Amino acid sequence: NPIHDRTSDYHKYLKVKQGDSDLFKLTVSDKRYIWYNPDPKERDSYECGEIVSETSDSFTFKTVDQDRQVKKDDANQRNPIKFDGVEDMSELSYLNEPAVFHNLRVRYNQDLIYTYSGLFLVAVNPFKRIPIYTQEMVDIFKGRRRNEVAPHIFAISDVAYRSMLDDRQNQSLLITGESGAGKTENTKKVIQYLASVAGRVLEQQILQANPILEAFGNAKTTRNNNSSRFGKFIEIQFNSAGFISGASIQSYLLEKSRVVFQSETERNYHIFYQLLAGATAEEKKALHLAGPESFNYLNQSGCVDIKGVSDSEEFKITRQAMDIVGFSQEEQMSIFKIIAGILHLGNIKFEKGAGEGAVLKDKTALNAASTVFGVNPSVLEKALMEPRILAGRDLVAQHLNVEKSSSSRDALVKALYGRLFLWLVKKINNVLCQERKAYFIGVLDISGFEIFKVNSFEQLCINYTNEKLQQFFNHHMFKLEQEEYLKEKINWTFIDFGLDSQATIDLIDGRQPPGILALLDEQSVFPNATDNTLITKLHSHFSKKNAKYEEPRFSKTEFGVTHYAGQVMYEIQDWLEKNKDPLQQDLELCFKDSSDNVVTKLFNDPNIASRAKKGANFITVAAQYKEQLASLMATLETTNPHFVRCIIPNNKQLPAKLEDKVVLDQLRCNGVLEGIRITRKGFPNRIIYFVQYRFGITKIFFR
Ligand SMILES: Nc1ncnc2c1ncn2[C@@H]1O[C@H](COP(=O)(O)OP(=O)(O)O)[C@@H](O)[C@H]1O
Ligand SMILES: O=C1c2ccccc2N=C2N(c3ccccc3)CC[C@@]12O
Ligand code: VO4
Ligand SMILES: [Mg+2]
Ligand SMILES: [Mg+2]
Numbered sequence: 001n002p003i004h005d006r007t008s009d010y011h012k013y014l015k016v017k018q019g020d021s022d023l024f025k026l027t028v029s030d031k032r033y034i035w036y037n038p039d040p041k042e043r044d045s046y047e048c049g050e051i052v053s054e055t056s057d058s059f060t061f062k063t064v065d066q067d068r069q070v071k072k073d074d075a076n077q078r079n080p081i082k083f084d085g086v087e088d089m090s091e092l093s094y095l096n097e098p099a100v101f102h103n104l105r106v107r108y109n110q111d112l113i114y115t116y117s118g119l120f121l122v123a124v125n126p127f128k129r130i131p132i133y134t135q136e137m138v139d140i141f142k143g144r145r146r147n148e149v150a151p152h153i154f155a156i157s158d159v160a161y162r163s164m165l166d167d168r169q170n171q172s173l174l175i176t177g178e179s180g181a182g183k184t185e186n187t188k189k190v191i192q193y194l195a196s197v198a199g200r201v202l203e204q205q206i207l208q209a210n211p212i213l214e215a216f217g218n219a220k221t222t223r224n225n226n227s228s229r230f231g232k233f234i235e236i237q238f239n240s241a242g243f244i245s246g247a248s249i250q251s252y253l254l255e256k257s258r259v260v261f262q263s264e265t266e267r268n269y270h271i272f273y274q275l276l277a278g279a280t281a282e283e284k285k286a287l288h289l290a291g292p293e294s295f296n297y298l299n300q301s302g303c304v305d306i307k308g309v310s311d312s313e314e315f316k317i318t319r320q321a322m323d324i325v326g327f328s329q330e331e332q333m334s335i336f337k338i339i340a341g342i343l344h345l346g347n348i349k350f351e352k353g354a355g356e357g358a359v360l361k362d363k364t365a366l367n368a369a370s371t372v373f374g375v376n377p378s379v380l381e382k383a384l385m386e387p388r389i390l391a392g393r394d395l396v397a398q399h400l401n402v403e404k405s406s407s408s409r410d411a412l413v414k415a416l417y418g419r420l421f422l423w424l425v426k427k428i429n430n431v432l433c434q435e436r437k438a439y440f441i442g443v444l445d446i447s448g449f450e451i452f453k454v455n456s457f458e459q460l461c462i463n464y465t466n467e468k469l470q471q472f473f474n475h476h477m478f479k480l481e482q483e484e485y486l487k488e489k490i491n492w493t494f495i496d497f498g499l500d501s502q503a504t505i506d507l508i509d510g511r512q513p514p515g516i517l518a519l520l521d522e523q524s525v526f527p528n529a530t531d532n533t534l535i536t537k538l539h540s541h542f543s544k545k546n547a548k549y550e551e552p553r554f555s556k557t558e559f560g561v562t563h564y565a566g567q568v569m570y571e572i573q574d575w576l577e578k579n580k581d582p583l584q585q586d587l588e589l590c591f592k593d594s595s596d597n598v599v600t601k602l603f604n605d606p607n608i609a610s611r612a613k614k615g616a617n618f619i620t621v622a623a624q625y626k627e628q629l630a631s632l633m634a635t636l637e638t639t640n641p642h643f644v645r646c647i648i649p650n651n652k653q654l655p656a657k658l659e660d661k662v663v664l665d666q667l668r669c670n671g672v673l674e675g676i677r678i679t680r681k682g683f684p685n686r687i688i689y690f691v692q693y694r695f696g697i698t699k700i701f702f703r
Contacts, residue, residue: 002140003149010140013132014150016085017110026081033078034061035098036068044661046098048078078102087151088116090679100673101664108649108658114151117672118679119477120643121156124663125182128655133189138196153186153644157193160441160642165242172442172639176469176670177646178449178565180224180653184214186644187234187445194236194441198244202434206236206247208321209428213249215274215318216421219258220267223450225306225653229255229269230421231446231465233632237437245435250635251425252446252465252628253621255458256414257578259342262301263452269417270314272298273305275339278315287340288368297346297413326431334598337372338420344369345413350385350405357399358385374595380587384409387584407577412587419602419609426608442639444469444632448646449565457578460516460570461625463563464508468629470564470670471501472636473643477675481682488696490683497674501564504548508561509626513541516561517622524579524620535559535572564669579620645670 002008006018019027032051037043049061049068060069076096083092084106092099100117104124107115111130115122132152141154143162149155160171173190175183188210195203214226221227231252239245262268276284276292284290292298305311322332347365350358360366360381370377385405386397400408449466450459478497485492509515514522519537523529538559542549550560550567558569591603603609612619619627647666650659667673683694683701694701 002136009131009134009136010150013111013130014114014137014152016107016112034059034070035076035078035096035102036061036063036070038063038065044097044664046076046101046660085110085112088118090116090118090676092676095673095676095680097664097667097673100667100676101660104647104663105658112151114153116146116151117645118676119684120645120675121151121153122645122647122672123153123182123186124647124649124658125180125185126655127649127653133192135196138193141193142197153189154193156642156644157190158197160640161194161197161242163640164238164439164441167640168439170440170442170639172444172636172641173644174444174469174472174636174641175644175646176448176466176473178223178466178648178666179221179227179447180651181448181646181648181666183445183448183646184218184226184228186646187443190441190443191234191236195244198236198238198242200243202246202432203244205325205431206244208324209247209249209432211314211317211321212325212424212428213251215271215314216269216424217251217254219262219269220265220303220306221450222263222265222452223651225309226270228445228447229258231444233635234443234445235437235440236443237435238439238441239435240438245437247432248429249425249432250632251421252632253461253625254418254421255447256418257456257458259414259417260297260346260410263454264301265303266301267303267306268298268301270311271318271339272343273311274315274318275336277311278313278319279336283336287336287372288344289340295343295346297343325428327427331427331598334596335420335424337374337596338416338599338602341369341372342413342416344372345409345416348384348409350402350409352402355399356401358402358405360385373591373599375590375593375599379590379593383584383586383590384412387586389585408584408587411581411583412591415583415587416591416602420598422608423598423602423605442635444636449563451566451568455568455570456573457570457575457621459568460508460561461622463561463565463568464505465629466565467501467504467508467563468633470499471505472633472641473675474499474501474671476641476643477671477678481678484686485683485696485701488686488699488701490694490696490701495678495681497671497678499564499671499674503546504561504563507542507546507548516542517626520575520579520622521620524576524622525617529576531557531572531575534575538572566665566669579622580618581621645672 002010034049034051035046036049037045038047039045047064049063051059051061052067053060058069058071059075060067076098077094079092079094079099084103086092086103089100089103104115108124111126113124113126138154141149141152141158144158146155146159160173164171175186177183195206217230218226218228233250235248236244237246258268273292276289279289292304298304344365349362351361353359366381367377370380386399388395388397446465446469447462449463482494507515509517516538519541523534523537535557539551543551548562552558552560552569557572560567560569588603591599594600601608614623647663650657650662683703686699686701688698690700692703
């Protein structure tokens with residue numbers, strides 16, 4: 001038993017290290033301590049002070065430098081240090097902000113990133129490798145109850161799996177966190193663990209799905225070098241006997257705008273850098289490829305490499321993963337042709353002709369794109385600069401200017417890339433679809449809460465998704481929990497835990513009165529609407545009317561939303577075009593005639609290519625977003641949830657650097673302390689009258 005052996009890797013890496021005789025002396029001390037703010041302007045910066053005296057209502061304590069006094073009602077008492085490193089913080093005597101943070105600090109300082117906070121797991125990103133995910137670690141956790149073993153993502157994965165078998169009920173693992181917190185890395189460990197303990201080719205294909213999805217769907221942002229730019233719900237499927245029988249990836253809207261634009265220091269999707277770094281010399285000749293600095297879509301941000309990442313070595317991994325999942329050699333070729341042709345399209349330079357319409361004087365990029373896509377360059381050229389539309393019923397060739405031609409070219413690119421992504425996921429899913437499931441454990445890995453210098457429509461939807469997920473945690477931990485006590489009349493006084501995202505949710509997606517997204521959609525079919533009339537309308541509805549909305553005084557093009565995780569200012573530029581997501585039909589006609597078998601599916605397969613109709617108009621992106629979100633929330637309601645709260649230590653992506661204010665903001669807005677308090681004060685378990693106690697209408701309830 002490595003569990004009981006102090007020299008095991010299990011002890012070394014997952015257990016608090018043996019304290020020494022000096023620490024023993026400190027542990028048995030009769031002295032008492034308080035967490036205080038040396039600077040009251042700075043509420044999250046705490047030191048420890050000895051309590052030197054008390055009255056009926058106050059403590060006096062030493063400060064690190066004088067003596068101060070504080071009302072006992074305002075005092076954040078330090079826990080007896082025997083609590084330092086505790087595995088489940090519901091056991092702390094004093095439940096307060098600096099004490100919770102301190103316990104996480106003690107564990108983190110020893111590379112103990114997992115800690116229970118009552119019923120849910122907290123995971124603080126190490127930003128370095130820690131050897132706790134080996135097969136040997138997996139074997140240890142196999143079938144062990146949560147209290148029998150150290151905190152670990154494997155442990156909560158096992159708890160769900162046993163609950164699935166024992167209760168014959170589908171489960172979910174909901175991993176929350178702002179961008180860079182560790183959601184995707186924990187998601188991968190859950191999958192790894194389930195595939196190992198419930199496993200028997202299929203298991204390898206489930207695992208190899210991920211490098212394919214990341215190469216194409218992750219990118220370096222200023223918050224995360226491997227940022228997920230699409231969310232996913234992964235259903236791991238099991239038969240009646242509890243063995244893995246398939247899996248299904250639900251992917252959510254991809255940030256397509258990143259293909260054509262990246263902010264300074266950021267990167268485009270990894271795949272672009274992987275192709276250019278890892279392609280053979282004549283893979284490169286045949287695709288007309290050179291270095292990333294040669295491509296407008298890769299040379300704007302100032303960043304082409306990521307610290308510690310070999311794009312060439314990752315390319316090998318992406319190709320191996322494609323082999324294992326079963327993409328043919330021609331399919332793969334076609335994939336890279338699409339990637340290369342996108343880079344070429346981005347190199348097309350429109351200019352003004354004799355009139356207002358654009359021309360193409362240099363056709364090098366156009367011809368290179370058309371060659372790799374297998375389309376006609378004259379046709380493509382005409383579809384870019386002179387697309388035909390209806391005017392009433394007449395067919396009228398437009399002649400677009402430089403800016404409109406360039407926008408149209410970008411539209412074609414984003415559609416190519418988003419449709420390729422959907423096709424990758426479809427292909428992967430068909431391979432993993434080998435049996436009707438009996439049960440599933442779904443793992444949710446969304447794009448996490450994020451704030452940039454410039455926040456756009458995509459950031460509003462990402463942040464709203466994170467808001468909705470926090471609301472789901474609030475509903476499960478506090479609201480449904482107390483509704484049960486009160487449906488069962490068990491002598492409970494209702495506690496207002498002060499966590500309600502409802503006002504922010506309503507602001508964004510309210511129906512009557514219409515919220516932000518409804519108003520966006522209204523403006524999107526209003527024939528003369530502009531981004532300026534859009535923000536005017538938002539201001540007219542919400543400015544000084546909605547407490548979560550701010551019309552800023554320093555800008556006419558931004559509005560503020562107060563999210564659970566902080567206020568975010570949103571830039572309105574391009575929201576109508578983003579929401580309408582137009583593409584010229586002549587571009588689709590051009591690509592429907594491609595000689596490439598993959599390209600042709602992207603344009604002819606209605607499940608990839610066709611867009612749904614809302615009466616007279618195509619479904620907007622906001623409406624697509626809402627359907628996906630509603631479908632997700634509906635699926636989660638069919639499941640028993642388990643929450644993992646990923647916590648980023650700092651905003652620098654560095655190990656061994658826990659920052660007080662960064663971490664405490666997350667513990668606050670995540671509701672971690674509230675969640676510990678409900679665990680303590682409530683009655684987690686109840687059985688119908690079954691053959692520190694409460695007798696309800698139909699049920700026994702216990703602490
Ligand atoms: N448990 C972990 N072990 C080692 N590194 C991790 C762990 N969790 C996160 N990281 C590091 O942090 C980065 C960001 O984490 P990730 O899971 O991609 O964040 P997100 O929450 O945005 O999905 C990873 O690429 C890796 O460098
Ligand atoms: O987590 C997500 C997500 C999860 C559920 C439903 C929709 C989602 N949308 C997401 N995104 C999005 C991108 C462009 C426009 C709008 C949204 C990016 C992350 C996302 O897929
Ligand atoms: O940076 V993460 O979008 O994968 O939350
Ligand atoms: Mg991620
Ligand atoms: Mg600004």
